[PDB]
Ligand binder design. Structure first.
Ligand code: ZN
Length: 257
């Protein structure tokens, strides 16, 4: 089974998933000198007012917070998108040290972690069907840098000891994802893929320009989780990010001048 550790890491993924070497893989480096402003781009509309969180779990690669996606409560529209996209889950990628951890980079610079809010295109009926379509998913990417604590993140941090090892889960209601957004919604966008197997090229990436600040103590809690399940040998969940992939024939557009 795939992972991030020397013998089963990103460099090996192609053997089981040949799409790893596709034409639209993620993440990529965002080159600001090459990213072009596109006047056709509409502003993002993020409606998270009635978001309904359900639970949080350790799946062996990250921890995901899942939401009720049965109704058009927490949805993303506008920007480069055609329809309505429902929020299904969010999770992070982070490093062993503060100087690395993000998947996307900006002018080659890495952040401490990256937040992914995953949405699926309602016209397909459910995530399982959406995930296989080129316009199936929209992922909002937000960079984290170390500084002042993010008050909206604390509820997540405080529950992590409860899902330390793989397969562990816990109820997690009333979490409001608006507390994880930066002030500005200026963004870059490009067509890409899921950055974990099965690596399907079905994602429209929306990467926010403004990072959010989190504290060292908050990020340290991420680093104490385990890739391994209970009873198995300890393996800290760190550096669960895929390196930048070739841009190839794609163009990154900017919503801002
Ligand atoms: Zn992710």
């Amino acid at each position: 089974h795939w992972g991030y550790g020397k013998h089963n890491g990103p460099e090996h993924w192609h053997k089981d998933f040949p799409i790893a070497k596709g034409e639209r893989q993620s993440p990529v480096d965002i080159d600001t000198h090459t990213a072009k402003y596109d006047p056709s781009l509409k502003p993002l509309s993020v409606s998270y007012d009635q978001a309904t969180s359900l639970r949080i779990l350790n799946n062996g690669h990250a921890f995901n917070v899942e939401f009720d996606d049965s109704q058009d409560k927490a949805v993303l529209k506008g920007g480069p998108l055609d329809g309505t996209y429902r929020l299904i889950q969010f999770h992070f990628h982070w490093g062993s040290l503060d100087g690395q951890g993000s998947e996307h980079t900006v002018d080659k610079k890495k952040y401490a972690a990256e937040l992914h809010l995953v949405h699926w295109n309602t016209k397909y009926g459910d995530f399982g069907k959406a995930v296989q379509q080129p316009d199936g998913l929209a992922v909002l990417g937000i960079f984290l840098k170390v500084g002042s604590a993010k008050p909206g993140l604390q509820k997540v941090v405080d529950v992590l000891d409860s899902i330390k090892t793989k397969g562990k889960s816990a109820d997690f209601t009333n979490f409001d994802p608006r507390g994880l957004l930066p002030e500005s919604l200026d963004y870059w966008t490009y067509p890409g893929s899921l950055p974990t197997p099965p690596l399907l090229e079905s994602v429209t990436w929306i990467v926010l320009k403004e990072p959010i600040s989190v504290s060292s103590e908050q990020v340290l809690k991420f680093r104490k989780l385990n890739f391994n399940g209970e009873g198995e040998p300890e393996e800290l969940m760190v550096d669960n990010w895929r390196p930048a992939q070739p841009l190839k024939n794609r163009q990154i557009k900017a919503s801002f001048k």
